[PDB]
Ligand binder design. Structure first.
Ligand SMILES: CCN[C@H]1C[C@H](C)S(=O)(=O)c2sc(S(N)(=O)=O)cc21
Ligand SMILES: [Zn+2]
Length: 257
């Protein structure tokens, strides 16, 4: 029932998911001048060379690319984390125009889109168990700005026409998610939540400082997707982002000066 529209969007979510008004909700604005450089923070370790993508899917809220997480193949470690987190899926949030679409903001600046690579802590055995734990997930957030094309995104773009409406999926094997990463792995980090229902407070957020650039043609393809199912009144999948939430009793730490 939940969505991004006037009658089911972020302002309505708390009714079915009261934790929407909790103490560690995401996304947040990253105030670069308030964030503290923490020299104790380790470099991120992104090990994606054995990543095995499975399928790409329109779920009525975003599109996602899913991975085989039945063993340690695509994993995130290091940074603020202890232990190993397996990549399960990635998805995006984007806007109706280039001046909005990101969930996190940087000094109130909104990017055109935001990529989330979702990982779960192997010590909990599966994703369903992990989301019930304060250190269950690590989500790697990457900003998208519009400019030059991102070659590593093109295979994704190429196939969106085949998953236009809710419930559609396609084979999406042999995709290398390394092609979506920026040069630098400098990051901000803070304790937060899923940004969609059920909004569980189970996420260590790792948001990269460096955006990737994607082309206008690439993000236009995102905006042609549909929230609706096939045969239903067409409502473009645009503006599928939750606004910044109160930081409350939290510190955002920077891995860089
Ligand atoms: C459709 C809702 N999906 C939820 C629950 C899934 C179990 S998930 O894969 O853990 C995940 S990751 C994010 S986000 N936007 O914070 O990165 C939202 C969700
Ligand atoms: Zn997300």
């Amino acid at each position: 029932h939940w969505g991004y529209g006037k009658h089911n969007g972020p302002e309505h979510w708390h009714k079915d998911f009261p934790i929407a008004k909790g103490e560690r909700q995401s996304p947040v604005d990253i105030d670069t001048h308030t964030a503290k450089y923490d020299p104790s923070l380790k470099p991120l370790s992104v090990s994606y060379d054995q990543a095995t993508s499975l399928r790409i899917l329109n779920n009525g809220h975003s599109f996602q690319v899913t991975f085989d997480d039945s063993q340690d193949k695509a994993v995130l470690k290091g940074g603020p984390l202890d232990g190993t987190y397996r990549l399960i899926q990635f998805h995006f949030h984007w806007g109706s125009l280039d001046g909005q679409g990101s969930e996190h903001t940087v000094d109130k600046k909104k990017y055109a889109a935001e990529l989330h690579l979702v990982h779960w802590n192997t010590k909990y055995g599966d994703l369903g168990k992990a989301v019930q734990q304060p250190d269950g997930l690590a989500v790697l957030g990457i900003f998208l700005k519009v400019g030059s094309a991102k070659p590593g995104l093109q295979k994704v773009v190429d196939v969106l026409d085949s998953i236009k409406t809710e419930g559609k999926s396609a084979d999406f094997t042999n995709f290398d998610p390394r092609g979506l990463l920026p040069e630098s792995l400098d990051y901000w980090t803070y304790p937060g939540s899923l940004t969609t229902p059920p909004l569980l407070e189970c996420v260590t957020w790792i948001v990269l400082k460096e955006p990737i650039s994607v082309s206008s043609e690439q993000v236009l393809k995102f905006r042609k997707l549909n929230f609706n199912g096939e045969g239903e009144p067409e409502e473009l999948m645009v503006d599928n982002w939750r606004p910044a939430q109160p930081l409350k009793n939290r510190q955002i730490k920077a891995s860089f000066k």
